[PDB]
Amino acid sequence: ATVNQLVRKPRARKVAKSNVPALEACPQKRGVCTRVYTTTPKKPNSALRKVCRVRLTNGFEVTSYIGGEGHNLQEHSVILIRGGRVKDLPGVRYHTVRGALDCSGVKDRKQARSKYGVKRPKA
Amino acid sequence: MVTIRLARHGAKKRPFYQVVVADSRNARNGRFIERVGFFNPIASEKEEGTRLDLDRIAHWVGQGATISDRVAALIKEVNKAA
Amino acid sequence: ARYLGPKLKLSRREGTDLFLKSGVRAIDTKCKIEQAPGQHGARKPRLSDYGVQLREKQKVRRIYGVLERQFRNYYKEAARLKGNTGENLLALLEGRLDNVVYRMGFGATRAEARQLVSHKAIMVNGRVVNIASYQVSPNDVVSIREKAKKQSRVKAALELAEQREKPTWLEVDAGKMEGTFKRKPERSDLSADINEHLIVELYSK
Amino acid sequence: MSRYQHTKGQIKDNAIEALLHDPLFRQRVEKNKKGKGSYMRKGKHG
Amino acid sequence: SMQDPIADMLTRIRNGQAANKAAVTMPSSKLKVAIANVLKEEGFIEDFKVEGDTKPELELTLKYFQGKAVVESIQRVSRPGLRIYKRKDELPKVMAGLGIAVVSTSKGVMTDRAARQAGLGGEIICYVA
Amino acid sequence: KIRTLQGRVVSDKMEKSIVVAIERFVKHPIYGKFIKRTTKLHVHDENNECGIGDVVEIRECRPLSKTKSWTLVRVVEKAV
Amino acid sequence: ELQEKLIAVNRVSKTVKGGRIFSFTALTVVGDGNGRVGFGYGKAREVPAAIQKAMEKARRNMINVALNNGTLQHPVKGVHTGSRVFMQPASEGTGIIAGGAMRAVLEVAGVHNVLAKAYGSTNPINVVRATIDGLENMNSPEMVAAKRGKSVEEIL
RNA sequence: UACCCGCAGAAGAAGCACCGGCUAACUCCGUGCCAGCAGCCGCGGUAAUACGGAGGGUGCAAGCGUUAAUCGGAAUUACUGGGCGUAAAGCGCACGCAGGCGGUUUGUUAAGUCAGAUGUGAAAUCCCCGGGCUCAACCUGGGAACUGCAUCUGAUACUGG
RNA sequence: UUAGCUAGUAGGUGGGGUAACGGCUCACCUAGGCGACGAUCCCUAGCUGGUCUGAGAGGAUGACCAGCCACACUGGAACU
Ligand SMILES: [Mg+2]
Ligand SMILES: [Mg+2]
Ligand SMILES: [Mg+2]
Ligand SMILES: [Mg+2]
Ligand SMILES: [Mg+2]
Ligand SMILES: [Mg+2]
Ligand SMILES: [Mg+2]
Ligand SMILES: [Mg+2]
Ligand SMILES: [Mg+2]
Ligand SMILES: [Mg+2]
Ligand SMILES: [Mg+2]
Ligand SMILES: [Mg+2]
Ligand SMILES: [Mg+2]
Ligand SMILES: [Mg+2]
Ligand SMILES: [Mg+2]
Ligand SMILES: [Mg+2]
């Protein structure tokens, strides 16, 4: 607290790491699905959450959530991941991008389509 | 050598010329010794297009500075005006 | 760059009459002004502190027909300028060419005035100006060009204006179809219902 | 469809039994709306 | 050890004001005396009196208005651990000009306003509200 | 009049040469504290007149060696 | 003439043999829009009754504040419990720049132009109290002249 | 080419996010701890304003969302501007070198400090008063500023010698 | 959770060399010099005018534009 003390040894700024380290300051990264599976979330939530273990462009091996109802994904499927952690799922730090690369858009969506890669219903 | 020349400093299709004293090797819009006035070719009526600090120019000439053709023309015009 | 939907809806949402229609017919006969628009109009929910400010801001934006980024820019400009900030903003809003035209009485609505401005009907100091956001300076004459002088809408607008209360900061000629922007308007010249301060507060968080 | 990744590793004898002894077939206990574990600090819409 | 006499004096004054003491006494110093004089001029104390030859004692008569203390707040600015020097344009305003800042200037110890008028800065001794 | 600096002779072992620590009283950029900072300098001295802990006035000149671009003008307070 | 507004209403609990008994605590603040400011903190089993109680409390135990042209006279700190507060006078047109409860109390007071910040804890009841304290402590030029035995023109 | 004039006819030209609370905007149907959502808190187990659709609304708008990235809020490294009895935090206690700080008077010095000046602190950028593109963005004239450093002349209350 | 580093090393005298001062280099003499006000070693990094953020102080940053530096397949070398 003393000014002399500060002069002697200055205040150390809080070194904050990123919660999305495999992205490496990139908005998105491309990767290959090592395996696609479902997992049970932690309490108090009950589901079978769709998720994929991805071998990334930059050598990292992560797991990424698959948003939306139904997906075309399987092994050796080239996908784009975007970051964003799933609170329920243990170790999941990434979202797959719906409507980019091998990943298809969600079927029969009419709202929030941007998030789910769904094209305009032409009428 | 030391030269008195125009540096184009405007917009696309709207040039504004800053007359500068500079080492000739330097880039047109780059390093310069002294800015000795301005010229605006797209200047409208009722405003000063060209204004040059003549004394400084004279000093530079005395020192041994070359004058660009356009700059010389501008100087001549100024002299006529005055 | 414009709102293209129902106009009286906006007024209803606000609560007040925003002068969004000409005023040949009364607002109460043309719409349920007291009731909010939509399915849940009858319900009147209690509005938050942020909410009220936002609503006020919207009101003002609606009044002039100014979209958000432009409004923000205007606010910034007001802040930059010396004196009262909200007042400055109001003055800036007034300065808008379309608004000026409306005040004069060449447009029945401000939208109409804007349209006129767009369509090359309006000359500022003998120069045809096309932009609605043009800031009219003091001692600037603003007139209808002779091409647009034969328009029946313009005369109707003038007539409507004649019925309405005339601004002190302007001098308009009906026959000549020209108006002189005398001076930038004071706060007392403008409407008291506008709470500029709330708007100012809003843009400070 | 997608495979469920069970936390049982290499199943040797019976699969169904293994699945039963997994988070997948864990007990689901309702939170009371009235009674014991019933108190809500903040409502769903409050 | 005693490292700041001025600060100590100020503390004493504060304590007196708190405890409703009529007079506060302390070992006298030149700077201290000057400060006291300044305060008197500004009207935060009633009177100051130096008494003694070998070891003189400054005695301050404290000021009270309507049952309450005149000196509301009194804080040192420059201190031995951290010296503070300001220029004429950099001179602070206590209580938006209402309170005073005692400043040791080239031309003697005076209030901030006086310094500003003169056109000179220096060591800001204390803020008084 | 010439630009010159004062300091104490930290060492005088090397021939024709002295190292003179210069105490400068700088203010800290952030904290506002006034701190004694030191500037060690290799100084030229002909005749080896200087002792240890001696106060000396020194001036900048053309470099005489790898580290030495300063020469003494006058020695003050040569107490031991 | 008296403007009055509720800041925050909170449900509080007392635990008994049966279960919990829930009560409502309403924090209100009143002001005349000039000098007078008064906060009220009412408590009842029902919200409206609590609010009424708060209002009643606010109406009595009022405090007069020296305001100069619809704003503060000098930068002033206010402290209560964890809530440590700073508020600064500003030029006309800036609006009330204050957070939460603070904003409310200033508005009822009748100040129109302030830049204010709440440090430490931001508990409504405490913070409003702190603000009120700050307001109280803030003295006028005339008052200071009276105290120092001088004219207003001598201090400026 | 900008720019101007004429021609025809509303003609060729509106989406994106969100609507449990924070946070502006609510209902019905579908589903039934499933599917799914989610920034945090959490929502969903058959009357879901939190999932999906629809109607209605709100906010932005030729953009609107999502992610990444930095600062802000975050007085949460607190110089301004935090603390340490019990929440994280007083070395187990002492002595003591370097270091930091140091009662009072006079004189002197002028290192710190303050004042004025001189040289520099590139231009652009930022800010102020203006001018020019129909307005703006943008360009631009003049100023201010560049909180600094160096040198000279002074002031000497305070700090130092 | 890098504490000791350095023999052309630090200085001197004399020769040589540079457009120019100089361990720049060589011969001999002295035994120095730097280092907790962080030497050395390790990791990262072009620097600035500025930019972004912020009430400010600060924090982050150095695309464009302008100044300076360094590099030109990698490592060396000279000539003009
Ligand atoms: Mg021509
Ligand atoms: Mg303003
Ligand atoms: Mg009992
Ligand atoms: Mg809402
Ligand atoms: Mg249902
Ligand atoms: Mg929601
Ligand atoms: Mg839904
Ligand atoms: Mg901070
Ligand atoms: Mg703390
Ligand atoms: Mg503890
Ligand atoms: Mg102990
Ligand atoms: Mg002393
Ligand atoms: Mg002395
Ligand atoms: Mg590199
Ligand atoms: Mg801040
Ligand atoms: Mg290549």
Q: Concatenated DSSP letters for C101-139?
A: HHHHTS-SSHHHHHHHHHTT-EEESSSB---TT-BPPTT
Query: Chain A: nearest CA to F24, how far in angstroms?
Result: 16
Distance A15 CA to ligand 14 centre (A): 22
Residues C11 and C78 in one domain: yes
Q: Do residues A50 and D2 make contact, with C-beta atoms less than 8 angstroms apart?
A: yes
Q: What is the C-alpha separation between G39 and G8, in angstroms, rounded?
A: 12
CATH class of G64-148: alpha beta
Q: Report angle CA B42, B46, B47 to the nearest 5 degrees.
A: 55
CA distances from E94 to G30, G70, G132 (A): 31, 21, 21
**Substitution target from G96, G102, G103 for chain C, most C beta carbons within 10 A:** G96
Residue C118 lies in a domain: yes
Residue nearest H41 (alpha carbon to C1'): D42
Please give the tally of structural domains in chain C.
Answer: 2
Closest to C194 (Cα-Cα) out of C46, C97, C53:
C53
Does A touch C (3+ CB pairs < 8 Å)?
A: no
Residue F58 to residue F41: CA distance in whole angstroms: 10
Q: Per the structure, how many domains does chain B have?
A: 1
Domains and CATH numbers, chain E: 5-69 (3.30.1370.30), 74-128 (3.30.1490.10)
How distant is C1' of I29 from CA of F4, in Å? 33
Distance B41 CA to ligand 1 centre (A): 7
Distance from CA of G70 to the nearest CA of C (A): 13
Residue G149, token pair as written in the block: 């035995």
Query: Under 8 Å CB-to-CB from G37, ≥6 apart: which residues?
Result: G29, G30, G31, G62, G63, G64, G65, G105, G108, G109, G132, G135
Residues of chain A with C-beta less than 8 angstroms from the C-beta of F31: 3, 6-7
Which chain E residues have a beta carbon less than 8 Å from that of F35?
A: none
> Which chain G residues have a beta carbon less than 8 Å from that of E96?
73-75, 89
Q: Is the CB of B27 under 7 A from strand I?
A: yes
- C100 and C40 share a domain? no
**Domain range for F73:** 3-79
Measured in degrees and rounded to the nearest 5, phi and psi for residue C118 equal -60, -45
Domain count, chain F: 1
The structure was resolved experimentally with: cryo-EM
The CA distance from A105 to A110, in Å, is: 12
Mutate to test the interface with F, among E77, E82, E84 (most CBs of F within 10 A): E82
What is the nearest CA distance from E103 to chain F, expressed in angstroms?
Answer: 18
Contact residues, chain E, for A2 at CB < 8 Å: 81
Q: CA G148, CA E64: separation in Å to the nearest integer?
A: 9
Q: What is the 3-state secondary structure (H, E, C) of A47-95?
A: CCEEEEEEEECCCCEEEEECCCCCCCCCCCCEEEECCCCCCCCCCCCEE
Domain range spanning residue C72? 7-93+190-204
Phi (first) and psi of residue C199, to 5 degrees:
-60, -45
User: Would you give the end-to-end CA distance of chain D in angstroms?
Assistant: 39
Q: What is the dihedral of CA A51, A55, A61, A64, to 10 degrees?
A: -20
The two beta strands, G114-120 and E45-51, are unpaired
Contact C85 G95 (CB under 8 A): yes
Backbone angles phi, psi at E79, to 5 degrees: -145, 160
Short-list G136, G113, G132, G115, CA closest to G66: G136
CATH number of G3-63: 3.30.160.20
The CATH number for C42's domain is: 1.10.1050.10
Contact between D3 and A46 using a beta-carbon 8 Å cutoff: no
Task: Please tell me the distance from the alpha carbon of residue G24 to that of residue A96, in angstroms, as a whole number.
Answer: 47
Sequence-distant (6+) residues with CB within 8 A of G84 are: G77, G78, G118, G119, G120, G121, G130
Rounded to the nearest whole angstrom, what is the distance from the C-alpha of residue A12 to the centroid of ligand 10? Answer: 22
F48 touches strand I (CB under 7 A): no
Domain limits at B65? 1-81
Question: Which class for B53: exposed (0-12), middle (13-18), buried (19 or more C-beta within 10 A)?
Answer: middle
Number of separate domains in chain A: 1
The verdict on residue C2 lying in a domain is: no
Q: State the first-to-last Cα distance of chain E, in angstroms, to the nearest integer.
A: 29
Side-by-side strand order, sheet with G20-31: G3-15, G20-31, G36-44, G63-64
Q: How far does the CA of G143 sit from the C1' of I11, in Å?
A: 75
G97-107 core/surface letters (b: 16 or more CB in 10 A; e: else): bbebbbbbbbb
CA separation for the pair B26, D5 (Å, rounded): 68
Peptide-bond breaks in chain C following residues (C–N over 2.5 A) = none
Chain E residues near residue G147 by CB distance under 8 angstroms:
65, 70
Q: Subunits touching A (CB < 8 Å, at least 3 pairs)?
A: D, E, F
Strand I closer than 7 Å to the CB of F38? Answer: yes
**How far are the Cα atoms of A38, A71, A80, C68, F58 from residue A104, in angstroms, in the given order?**
18, 7, 11, 36, 79
Considering only CA atoms, which of E102, E88, E89 is closest in space to residue E38? E102
Expressed as residue numbers, the domain containing A54 is 1-123
Alpha carbons G98 and G105: distance in angstroms, whole number: 10
Domain ranges of chain G: 3-63, 64-148
Environment class of F33 (CB within 10 Å of its CB; exposed 0-12, middle 13-18, buried 19+): middle
Is C142 in contact with C124 (CB distance < 8 Å)? Answer: yes
